[PDB]
């Protein structure tokens, strides 16, 4: 039985069948139709943007805190994006309307941990790093 042809003239039906069923695999689907290119980064690794808002975001259950964040206007897209601002009092290194460098959170299009729905993090402020600034290597 096995519901699958075994025969030596069966070649195309086999391969076509796969060329079909392959679509149910998600990464294949998302890859094959442009999905990457339409996302707020336009397929890219990071993006530069402007800061519209500094915003607090109350954490998912069962955690309570205020996640410091920013809403950024991506310069390539002009799409609006909600991004997280890492470590401690780094929300202070940000002024409204700065240039800011933004990357994924490591789930490739999805939110991490207790921050609901927020898919991006802040990397650079003006030109400098949040790391450089935090450890106080450079000054803004």
């Amino acid at each position: 039985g096995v519901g699958k042809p075994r025969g030596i003239r069966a070649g195309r039906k086999l391969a076509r069948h796969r060329k079909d069923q392959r679509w149910a695999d998600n990464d294949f689907n998302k890859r094959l139709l442009g999905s990457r290119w339409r996302n707020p980064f336009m397929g890219a690794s990071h993006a530069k943007g402007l800061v519209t808002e500094k915003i607090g975001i109350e954490s998912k259950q069962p955690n309570s805190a205020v996640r410091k964040c920013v809403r950024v206007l991506l310069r390539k897209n002009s799409k609006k994006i909600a991004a997280f601002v890492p470590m401690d009092g780094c929300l202070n290194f940000l002024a409204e309307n700065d240039e800011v460098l933004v990357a994924g959170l490591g789930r490739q299009g999805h939110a991490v941990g207790d921050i609901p729905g927020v898919r991006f993090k802040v990397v650079c402020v003006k030109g400098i790093s949040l790391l450089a600034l935090f450890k106080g290597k450079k000054e803004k």
Binding site: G7, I8, R9, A10, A15
Partner: protein, 78 residues
């Protein structure tokens, strides 16, 4: 007019699934009036200079034979 079409059936091999696939090709051939050609006969044709848009082949030898049903469905790999 003085032209037929010929059909060559072959098995193309798909490496992965490790079996073959049934493909065919249609070659327009030129028939000299000196031949009696029944639909569904066996033709030998030599290469030729470009006679027309489609035709690069000319009929050399006809072999008579009987095909049952339509000529299309009949599959001979020789």
């Amino acid at each position: 007019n003085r032209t037929v079409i010929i059909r060559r059936d072959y098995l193309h091999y798909v490496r992965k699934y490790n079996r073959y696939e049934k493909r065919h090709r249609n070659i327009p051939v030129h028939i000299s009036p000196c031949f009696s050609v029944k639909e569904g006969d066996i033709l030998v044709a030599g290469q030729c200079r470009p006679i027309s848009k489609t035709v690069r082949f000319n009929a050399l030898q006809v072999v008579p034979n009987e095909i049952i049903g339509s000529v299309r469905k009949q599959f001979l790999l020789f």
